[PDB]
Design a protein around this nucleic acid. Structure first.
Lengths: 83, 185, 141, 221
RNA sequence: CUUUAAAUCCUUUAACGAGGAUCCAUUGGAGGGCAAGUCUGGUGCCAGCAGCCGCGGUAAUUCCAGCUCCAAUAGCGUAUAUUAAAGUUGCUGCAGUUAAAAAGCUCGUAGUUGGAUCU
C-alpha cells in the first residue's frame, strides 16, 4: 500500500490466478507455478527462456484447470488457433 | 422555587472488569513514577482523554472543508497547544487520536516541580505543593492536580512568604531557637 | 424480521407486542398478580413480629438442619418464614420482638441448601445483627 | 547440537541463498521443518500458554488422562501462530504445542482507519472466521483505541500486532478451542480479500527451486 | 480583621500547637469465576460457609480464631427496581427435520408486495 507521502508500506503483494483473477494465499498449497517453454520459430529448438502461469486451488478442486490453461494458451498463441 | 445551580457531572469512571492483571500493572506503574495518591485521579484523566478523543471522533466524522468542523478543530488544537500537550509545529487534525495518558500527566504541576529541580522526590514535590510554597505569576497554588499552560511555565518559583525561598522561619525552627536560648542561660 | 414491506409497521408492532407479551420476565414485571403475590408488596424491607422458632431440615448430600423464624408482617398480616443468617445469632432474638426482614438476593426464590425460605434477618430491636455478633453494640433490655 | 537439514527448503536456507521466509510466503510452499522459523524469527518471538484441558476415554483398565496443550506464538511485527498438541504428560505436550505453533504461523496485513497516514495499525477490512459455532468479527478502529474483545483475543491480537480493533462474538464461546481457531482463521483471512490497490496485473518471478536447481541437485540427496 | 439587617461560613494574620507525627482508616474477602497463604490451632455431616459449582463423616487451600497478603480508600458492603452485557424480543439483527416450534389441506374479502417501455 501507499500513504500520504506515497512510499511502499506493505510487506509483500500476493500473486494472482491467471484464470479467475483471484490471489493465492500462503496456506493455499494446491496452487501451481508451472512454466511453459517456447520453441524456436525456425527449427523448433529450445531457445532457453520460459513463460509461466498460475492457477488457484479451487479451480483444480472443482476440475477445470485444463481448459483454463487451454484458453490461456489460446490467448498466448502457443496452441494452434483452429485447435 | 430557589436560586440554585443543580449542575454537576462525574469526573472519573469505573472500568467493566474490576479484577485483572495488566491494566492494573500499568496504572500501578504510572502511580509509581508519577506519584499519584489513588486510582481515581488516573480514572479522571482517562475519562477526560476519552471525552476529547470521542469529540475528535465526531469532529473527524464530518466531511472536509466544513465551517463548524474547521472552527472547532482550530479551537481544539489551539487549546491543546496552549496547555502544552502538543508542540507548535505539528498542527494536524487527526494527530489528537495518537496521544496517551502520559501526555496528559506530563503537564501536571508535580511533574513540572520535579523536573525543574526545586524538589528532591516526587513525594517531596507533592507534599511541598500541598503545603503552599510555590507562587505562580505571583499567586499561591495549593492543588497538586494543576494544569500548567505553556506560557505560564517559566514563572514557577518559591513563594515569598516561604522559609525555603526566603522569609520568616516557621514554628519549628523558632521552637528550636527558643529552647536553645532557654538552655543556654 | 421477515415481513419486509416498505409500508409494514402496524403488523410488525403487533407481532412485537405479542411476542414481548410471550415472555417470563416482562410478564413478571408488567402484571399485578406477580406483585400482589409478593408479601413485601414491592418493598425492599419489611417489619414483622417473631411468633415461633423453627428448625428445618436440609437437602441431599449437604445435610445440616437450619434454624428459621416464622414472622408475621405488621402491614399485611401473614405468616412469612425468615432465616437467621449468621452463627450465634439466634440467641440474640427472643419471643415477641420486631425484626426487619429482607431477601437473600436471588429475587424472591429459594437460595442454597435451605428449602422454601427466601427471606433473611437484618435488624432486630433497632440494632444490627452484625453489631451484636462483632460486639460493637449491646442488645437493649 | 548442529542442525542437519532434511527438507530442500532447509538446505536452501542453510546455503545462504534464501534471504527470507517472506518469498516462501509469496510462493506458498508448505513447511514441515520447524527451525526455518527459528532461523528467521529470532529472539523477538514471544510465547504464551493459553489453558491446559484434560481429555479422557472411559475404558476397562481405568481412566487414562491425555492432556491437550493450547498455545499461541509470534513476534510483535506481523506473524502469529497457534498450536494444539495431544499427549500424556505436560512437558512433551507443551513442547509439541509450541513446535506445531511454530509450523503454522501466518503473516497479517495491517491497514488504516479513514486516513492512510503514518504506520499502519488496524485491519484493512472486515474479515471473519467460521469453525464450530463461533463467529468472530474484525472491524477496524481508529488510532490508540485498543482491542475490545474477550481477554484471550486481546492476547491473540497483541500477538498479531493489531493495536486497535473492534470485535463481536456469537454462539457458545465457552469452548476455547473452537473460539481460538475461529479467531485464527479470521485473522488469517486478512490476505484473501481483494482490494482495489491490488488491481495491478501481477508478474511472476522464478520459482525458488529454479534459481539454484543446480546447487540443490549437487548438495541435496 | 473581613463578611453579614447583625453574626456564624470562607480567606488573611498574631500567640500556641507532632518522633509509637497514640493527632492510632474502615469495608467485605483470600478453591474456581475473581486480583490474595496447600500458615497455624479448635469442632469434626453438628455448629456453620456458600449469589453458582460446591467446602463439613477425626489429615476443613472454603467452618471458627491469630499472622501475612490482595481490592477501593473516607470510604465500603447488603436487599429491592432499572439499564447494558441479551444477536435470550432480533427494524438493523433470533429461530421453526432431530434441542421449544409449519395450522391436516384448499379457496378466499380488507392489509401487505406487484413485468418492460415515454429524451
Amino acid at each position: 500500500m501507499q500513504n500520504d507521502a506515497g512510499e511502499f508500506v506493505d510487506l509483500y503483494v500476493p500473486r494472482k490466478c491467471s484464470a479467475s483473477n483471484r490471489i493465492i494465499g500462503a496456506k493455499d498449497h494446491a496452487s501451481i507455478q508451472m512454466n511453459v517453454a517456447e520453441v524456436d520459430k525456425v527449427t523448433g529448438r529450445f531457445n532457453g527462456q520460459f513463460k509461466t502461469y498460475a492457477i488457484c486451488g479451487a479451480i483444480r478442486r472443482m476440475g477445470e484447470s485444463d481448459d483454463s490453461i487451454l484458453r490461456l494458451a489460446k490467448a498466448d498463441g502457443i496452441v494452434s488457433k483452429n485447435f | 422555587p430557589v436560586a440554585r445551580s443543580w449542575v454537576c457531572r462525574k469526573t472519573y469512571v469505573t472500568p467493566r472488569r474490576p479484577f485483572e492483571k495488566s491494566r492494573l500493572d500499568q496504572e500501578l506503574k504510572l502511580i509509581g513514577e508519577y506519584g499519584l495518591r489513588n486510582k481515581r485521579e488516573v480514572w479522571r484523566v482517562k475519562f477526560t482523554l476519552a471525552k476529547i478523543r470521542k469529540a475528535a471522533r465526531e469532529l473527524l466524522t464530518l466531511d472536509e472543508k466544513d465551517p463548524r468542523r474547521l472552527f472547532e478543530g482550530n479551537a481544539l488544537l489551539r487549546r491543546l497547544v496552549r496547555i502544552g500537550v502538543l508542540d507548535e509545529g505539528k498542527m494536524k487534525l487527526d494527530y489528537i487520536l495518537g496521544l496517551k495518558i502520559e501526555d496528559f500527566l506530563e503537564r501536571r504541576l508535580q511533574t513540572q516541580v520535579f523536573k525543574l529541580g526545586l524538589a528532591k522526590s516526587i513525594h517531596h514535590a507533592r507534599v511541598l505543593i500541598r503545603q503552599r510554597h510555590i507562587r505562580v505569576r505571583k499567586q499561591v497554588v495549593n492543588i497538586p492536580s494543576f494544569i500548567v499552560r505553556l506560557d505560564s511555565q517559566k514563572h514557577i518559583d518559591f513563594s515569598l512568604r516561604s522559609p525555603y525561598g526566603g522569609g520568616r522561619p516557621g514554628r519549628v525552627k523558632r521552637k528550636n531557637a527558643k529552647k536553645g536560648q532557654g538552655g543556654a542561660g | 424480521g421477515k415481513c419486509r414491506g416498505l409500508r409494514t409497521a402496524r403488523k410488525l408492532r403487533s407481532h412485537r407486542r405479542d411476542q414481548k407479551w410471550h415472555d417470563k420476565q416482562y410478564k413478571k414485571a408488567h402484571l399485578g398478580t406477580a406483585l400482589k403475590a409478593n408479601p413485601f408488596g414491592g418493598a425492599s424491607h419489611a417489619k414483622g413480629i417473631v411468633l415461633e422458632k423453627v428448625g428445618v431440615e436440609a437437602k441431599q448430600p449437604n445435610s445440616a438442619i437450619r434454624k428459621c423464624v416464622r414472622v408475621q408482617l405488621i402491614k399485611n398480616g401473614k405468616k412469612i418464614t425468615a432465616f437467621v443468617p449468621n452463627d450465634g445469632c439466634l440467641n440474640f432474638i427472643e419471643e415477641n420482638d420486631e425484626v426487619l426482614v429482607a431477601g437473600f438476593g436471588r429475587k424472591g426464590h429459594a437460595v442454597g441448601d435451605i428449602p422454601g425460605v427466601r427471606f433473611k434477618v437484618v435488624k432486630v430491636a433497632n440494632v444490627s445483627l452484625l453489631a451484636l455478633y462483632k460486639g460493637k453494640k449491646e442488645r437493649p433490655r | 547440537k548442529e542442525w542437519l537439514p532434511v527438507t530442500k527448503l532447509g538446505r536452501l536456507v542453510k546455503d545462504m541463498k534464501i534471504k527470507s521466509l517472506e518469498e516462501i510466503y509469496l510462493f506458498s510452499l508448505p513447511i514441515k521443518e520447524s527451525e526455518i522459523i527459528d532461523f528467521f524469527l529470532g529472539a523477538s518471538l514471544k510465547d504464551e500458554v493459553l489453558k491446559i484441558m484434560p481429555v479422557q476415554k472411559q475404558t476397562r483398565a481405568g481412566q487414562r488422562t491425555r492432556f491437550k496443550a493450547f498455545v499461541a506464538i509470534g513476534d510483535y511485527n506481523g506473524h502469529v501462530g497457534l498450536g494444539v498438541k495431544c499427549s500424556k504428560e505436560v512437558a512433551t505436550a507443551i513442547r509439541g504445542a509450541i513446535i506445531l505453533a511454530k509450523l503454522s504461523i501466518v503473516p497479517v496485513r495491517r491497514g488504516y482507519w479513514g486516513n492512510k497516514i503514518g504506520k499502519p495499525h488496524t485491519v484493512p477490512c472486515k474479515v471473519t472466521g467460521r469453525c464450530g459455532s463461533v463467529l468472530v468479527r474484525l472491524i477496524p478502529a481508529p488510532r490508540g483505541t485498543g482491542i475490545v474483545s474477550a481477554p484471550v483475543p486481546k492476547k491473540l491480537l497483541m500477538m498479531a500486532g493489531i493495536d486497535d480493533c473492534y470485535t463481536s462474538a456469537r454462539g457458545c464461546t465457552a469452548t476455547l478451542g473452537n473460539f481460538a481457531k475461529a479467531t485464527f482463521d479470521a485473522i488469517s483471512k486478512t490476505y484473501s480479500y481483494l482490494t482495489p490497490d491490488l488491481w495491478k496485473e501481477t508478474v511472476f518471478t522464478k520459482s525458488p527451486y529454479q534459481e539454484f536447481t543446480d546447487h540443490l541437485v549437487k548438495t541435496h540427496t
